[PDB]
């Protein structure tokens with residue numbers, strides 16, 4: 001059929017066109033026509049330079065989140081044809097899990113289903129690694145899957161999670177920078193200290209749209225800051241993973257300081273850059289116990 | 291006699307007071323009244339004056355509480371009984387002296403010893419030192435959860451005032467930042483000769499630099515203490531780690547980042563930013579990691 005591309009790219013292009021408009025409105029309508037027209041050219045240069053630094057970090061982080069392909073399980077997590085033949089032909093439910101145990105003994109998996117059964121994906125025909133889940137939209141198993149984000153038309157998992165968090169952060173700073181600088185000129189237009197009708201429209205919407213996204217993404221950003229501190233994905237935050245000693249909402253937690261390092265790494269120079277720096281490989285994760 | 295030494299302790303406090311009193315006069319009168327309101331910007335004058343007083347009050351309120359909150363001392367239970375105190379003074383063997391202390395310490399909730407595995411005892415105060423408590427030569431007393439003695443507040447920073455001390459810093463950052471950000475545009479205008487008043491030119495110049503100097507100074511102090519609170523270590527413990535029954539532990543009193551902050555700030559969110567006492571416990575016993 002039309003597949004995701006026909007409609008899945010719609011939220012991306014909507015955000016893209018809003019961001020493109022915000023560039024034209026802030027740079028041309030505001031900085032060139034409004035601020036530079038008011039004979040305060042010093043503020044124009046500072047605003048234009050500062051705006052482009054936030055604009056670049058946002059678009060860079062947004063690009064990385066969209067086009068970073070989600071990681072999938074390695075070869076060891078696919079059932080062998082010998083094991084697949086017996087698994088597909090087996091009728092007894094108890095017998096099926098016994099085949100998995102022989103293959104699972106080689107790989108480092110510390111979690112099971114809510115029924116204490118080895119996590120297995122029927123459509124993908126493989127044994128789900130720890131924290132990995134199958135996405136119907138992505139049609140694949142995603143390592144450390146968080147959720148499918150329509151806004152980036154991609155899965156948010158082990159590969160792009162830090163890019164996703166930076167995409168949020170730089171959206172917060174971008175919207176905040178716009179609202180803070182536009183406010184004084186938004187007020188002047190409607191107290192009739194400034195008159196230009198073409199810029200009046202863009203300056204009003206620059207303030208309202210940036211304030212609408214700031215409030216929207218701030219709660220989302222604060223929520224994920226809590227998730228990273230607890231080392232829980234969005235899926236795990238609802239249905240806690242079941243370990244050998246039972247379900248644990250803190251099974252993958254290593255302490256607040258260590259949990260952030262798992263996502264952002266140990267080198268400070270990569271923390272704020274949308275460059276891959278997460279620890280591990282996405283198939284095995286350190287555990288709270290052993 | 292001591293009238294020269296006691297008065298000298300108030301010197302750093304009075305210096306801060308005169309800078310703060312001047313900064314009020316400079317910002318409110320010289321800047322808001324004479325410069326901004328004189329510049330026909332009557333909307334900005336009211337907004338700045340209202341915001342300034344909110345930061346000014348929170349700073350002075352936190353600063354007052356840190357100075358005049360008397361430091362807590364050990365309770366009665368940590369003093370040796372008259373029967374035990376008499377024998378302790380008469381005992382000649384060093385090992386025999388520890389036997390009296392060890393027997394009394396078994397009744398008290400003590401989990402730490404000195405670096406020499408000796409029961410912490412204060413000779414001058416004649417009491418058994420509670421955990422994390424230390425004797426201050428300036429205060430001439432044992433201070434519960436002592437952090438350090440501060441010349442800037444002429445008082446010990448310990449279990450009683452530590453949250454007031456942290457809020458005093460926090461509101462110094464916000465006060466200085468608010469001043470520097472709002473004064474900057476008028477600082478620039480004076481020296482591009484868009485404004486002329488020589489009386490206000492002087493105060494606006496120092497308003498920006500003094501607030502920037504203190505901001506840089508207290509920021510490092512604030513970031514350092516934010517680390518201490520996250521690790522549940524006092525300033526003293528950050529140098530000499532406390533020795534527990536299982537040996538010296540730099541994280542002996544740590545309970546995890548979230549709980550360590552709660553120990554200082556409490557469980558009620560409505561008290562976190564107010565210099566009103568809300569710390570957990572009593573300062574004589576503390577939860578342990580093990």
Ligand SMILES: CCCCCCCC/C=C\CCCCCCCC(=O)OC[C@@H](O)CO
Pocket residue numbers: 015018019022150151171174175178209210213216217220
């Ligand atoms: C000045 C303009 C700059 C704006 C750029 C900010 C970009 C923010 C991107 C996204 C914010 C969305 C706020 C979060 C809104 C989440 C609601 C949603 O999309 O539902 C999804 C689920 O129903 C799917 O099952």
Ligand SMILES: CCCCCCCC/C=C\CCCCCCCC(=O)OC[C@@H](O)CO
Pocket residue numbers: 306309310313441442462466469500501504507508511
């Ligand atoms: C424009 C308003 C001015 C706001 C004033 C903010 C008040 C900040 C209070 C103290 C800042 C000091 C930062 C510097 C702290 C120095 C470190 C110290 O330990 O000092 C003690 C030793 O020198 C022994 O005396």
Ligand SMILES: C[C@H](O)CC[C@H](C)O
Pocket residue numbers: 042043046474475478
């Ligand atoms: C010259 C102008 O007043 C400076 C603008 C700053 C960034 O606020």
Ligand SMILES: C[C@H](O)CC[C@H](C)O
Pocket residue numbers: 057268269270271272273
């Ligand atoms: C633009 C951003 O502030 C760069 C930070 C890196 C870590 O240097």
Ligand SMILES: C[C@H](O)CC[C@H](C)O
Pocket residue numbers: 347351
């Ligand atoms: C500055 C003001 O006085 C603080 C309020 C407390 C309760 O006294």
Ligand SMILES: C[C@H](O)CC[C@H](C)O
Pocket residue numbers: 551552555556562563
């Ligand atoms: C005011 C302070 O930053 C918040 C403390 C809480 C417990 O994290």
Ligand SMILES: C[C@H](O)CC[C@H](C)O
Pocket residue numbers: 348559560561562563564
């Ligand atoms: C000044 C500050 O907004 C007060 C917040 C407290 C927690 O109510």
Ligand SMILES: C[C@H](O)CC[C@H](C)O
Pocket residue numbers: 556558561566567568569
């Ligand atoms: C949390 C602490 O108990 C608050 C005390 C004041 C009097 O309300």
Ligand SMILES: [Zn+2]
Pocket residue numbers: 121123124125133134135140141
């Ligand atoms: Zn799958």
Ligand SMILES: [Zn+2]
Pocket residue numbers: 135136137138147148149154155156
């Ligand atoms: Zn997906």
Ligand SMILES: [Zn+2]
Pocket residue numbers: 412414415416424425426430431432
């Ligand atoms: Zn003492």
Ligand SMILES: [Zn+2]
Pocket residue numbers: 426427428429430438439440445446
């Ligand atoms: Zn002292």
